[PDB]
C-alpha cells in the first residue's frame, strides 16, 4: 500500500519562506493525486487551505501556495507568520481513496522562553473520607513545551503513583502539564510533607503541601 | 461555514453507531463530503468519500462491508453509518470537505467498558498560600469513562483566570482533570466560586462550591 512522505519538522523565522514537500513512496505525483494540505492547531478544529494541488480554499491568507515540483506536491508560506506555526497535513488521491501523510511541524521562531509556574493542591477533606488521597500538581506558561517532574516524599524521591500528562499548547502559545500522585491517606498523613519539583531548561521549581 | 457533528458515543464490540455531519453555510451539493477519523496518539486516516449526487462511494479497506456513508442534500447532512464496531475502529471522527474548516469532531470508543461517572473534588485556596496577591482554587475531576468532560465556572459567568488541563490516563484506563481559577486574594471572602462539572457519556451532572480550608 503506497505511503504519503512529509517532513516530520521545520523551522522559520518571521518573515521567512518556508517550503513543505509531499512525496509519494510509488512514484510521481500529477494533478490527478489531488493533494490537499490541512492545518491543525492546537484547540482548533483542522481546516484545509490548499485543494486540488493549488486551490486556495476561501480566507486562507495568500502567503500559502500549493504545486508539483519535481514530481512532489509542495506548499510554500512566502514571509511566514507566528500563527502559521502549527501541524500541516498532506493528504493524496490514489484513484480510489485518499491517504494522509504524517504532517510536518512547523515552527515559527520568537517565542520568548517562560519558566514554568507550578501549583500543587493537597487532598481534600472530601476525597479523605473516601479513604483516598491524590496529589495535584498543574504547570502552566512554560515555554518551549517540555518540563520533567519529580515527587518527593520528605526529602526522598518517589516513583510509585506518578501519572504526568504529555504538554499541551495554551491559547497564549504557551504550555501546561499536570501530574498526578496517588497515595493512601495513612501515607499522606504519616510524612512531614510532599513535594512537586519541576525541572525546565536547567532550571526547578518546587512547591510543597504539608497535612492539615 | 460550519459542520456540526453528532451522534459519537460509547458503543460495545459487534455494535452500531450512525454519525451525522449538518451543513451549512455553502452550496452543499456542489462538494465531495469526507468522513476522517484519528485515533489518539496515531495518525490522520481517511475512511470514506461521496460524491455530490451520492452515487460514488470509496471506503478504506479496513471498513469496506462495515460503513456506509451516505448524505441528504435535501437537508444538507452528510452520513456514516457504522457496522460490526471493533476496538480498531475508537477514533475521533470528522466530516471535511477539500476546502475549509473541517467539523470539530465526535467521539467513538467501541470497547466492551461501561462508562463511569466521575467523582469531584474541590481544590481550596489558602491565604498563606498566594503568590503575589492571587490565590488559586479549583475542582478535581477523577476517574471517569471515557472523554469527554466540561468544566464551567460560576455557569459559565466566570472565565478570567479559568484554565482547564487536559485529562491523565491512568494505568487503569479512567482519566482524570482538573480545572483551576486564579483570583485576587481580596474576592476570597466576597465572591462564591462553583465549578460545573458534565460528564455526557454517563450523565453524570455535579456541582461543587470551592471555599477556603
Ligand atoms: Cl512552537
Ligand atoms: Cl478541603
Known amino acids: 500500500q503506497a505511503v504519503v512522505i512529509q517532513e516530520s519538522a521545520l523551522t522559520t523565522s518571521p518573515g521567512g519562506t518556508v517550503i513543505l514537500t509531499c512525496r509519494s513512496s510509488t512514484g510521481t505525483i500529477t494533478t490527478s493525486n489531488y493533494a490537499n494540505w490541512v492545518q491543525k492547531k492546537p484547540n482548533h478544529v483542522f481546516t484545509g487551505l490548499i485543494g486540488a494541488t493549488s486551490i486556495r480554499a476561501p480566507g486562507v491568507p495568500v502567503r500559502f501556495s500549493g504545486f508539483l515540483i519535481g514530481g512532489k506536491a509542495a506548499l510554500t508560506i512566502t514571509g511566514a507568520q507566528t500563527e502559521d506555526d502549527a501541524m500541516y497535513f498532506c493528504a493524496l488521491w490514489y484513484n480510489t481513496h485518499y491517504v494522509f501523510g504524517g504532517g510536518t511541524k512547523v515552527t515559527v521562531l520568537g517565542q520568548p522562553k517562560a519558566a514554568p509556574s507550578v501549583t500543587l493542591f493537597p487532598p481534600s477533606s472530601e476525597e479523605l473520607q473516601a479513604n483516598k488521597a491524590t496529589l495535584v500538581c498543574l504547570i502552566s506558561d512554560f515555554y518551549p513545551g517540555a518540563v520533567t517532574v519529580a515527587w518527593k516524599a520528605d526529602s526522598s524521591p518517589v516513583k510509585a503513583g506518578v501519572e504526568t500528562t504529555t504538554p499541551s499548547k495554551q491559547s497564549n502559545n504557551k504550555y501546561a502539564a499536570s501530574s498526578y500522585l496517588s497515595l493512601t491517606p495513612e501515607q499522606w498523613k504519616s510524612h512531614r510533607s510532599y513535594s512537586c519539583q519541576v525541572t525546565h531548561e536547567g532550571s526547578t521549581v518546587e512547591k510543597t503541601v504539608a497535612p492539615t | 461555514v460550519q459542520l456540526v457533528e453528532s451522534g459519537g458515543g460509547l458503543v460495545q464490540p459487534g455494535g452500531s453507531l450512525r454519525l451525522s455531519c449538518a451543513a451549512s453555510g455553502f452550496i452543499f451539493s456542489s462538494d465531495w463530503m469526507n468522513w476522517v477519523r484519528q485515533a489518539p496518539g496515531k495518525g490522520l486516516e481517511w475512511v470514506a468519500n461521496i460524491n455530490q449526487d451520492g452515487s460514488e462511494k470509496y471506503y478504506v479497506d479496513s471498513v469496506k462491508g462495515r460503513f456506509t456513508i451516505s448524505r441528504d442534500n435535501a437537508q444538507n447532512s452528510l452520513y456514516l453509518q457504522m457496522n460490526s464496531l471493533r476496538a480498531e475502529d475508537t477514533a475521533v471522527y470528522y466530516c471535511?470537505?477539500?476546502?475549509?474548516?473541517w467539523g470539530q469532531g465526535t467521539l467513538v470508543t467501541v470497547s466492551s467498558a461501561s462508562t463511569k461517572g466521575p467523582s469531584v473534588f474541590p481544590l481550596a485556596p489558602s491565604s498563606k498560600s498566594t503568590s503575589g496577591g492571587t490565590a488559586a482554587l479549583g475542582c478535581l475531576v477523577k476517574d471517569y469513562f471515557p472523554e469527554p468532560v466540561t468544566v464551567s465556572w460560576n455557569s459559565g459567568a466566570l472565565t478570567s483566570g479559568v484554565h482547564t488541563f487536559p485529562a491523565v490516563l491512568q494505568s487503569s484506563g479512567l482519566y482524570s482533570l482538573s480545572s483551576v481559577v486564579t483570583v485576587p486574594s481580596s474576592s476570597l471572602g466576597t465572591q462564591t466560586y462553583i465549578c460545573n462539572v458534565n460528564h455526557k457519556p454517563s450523565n453524570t451532572k455535579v456541582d461543587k462550591r470551592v471555599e477556603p480550608k
Open positions: 471535511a470537505k477539500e476546502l475549509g474548516p
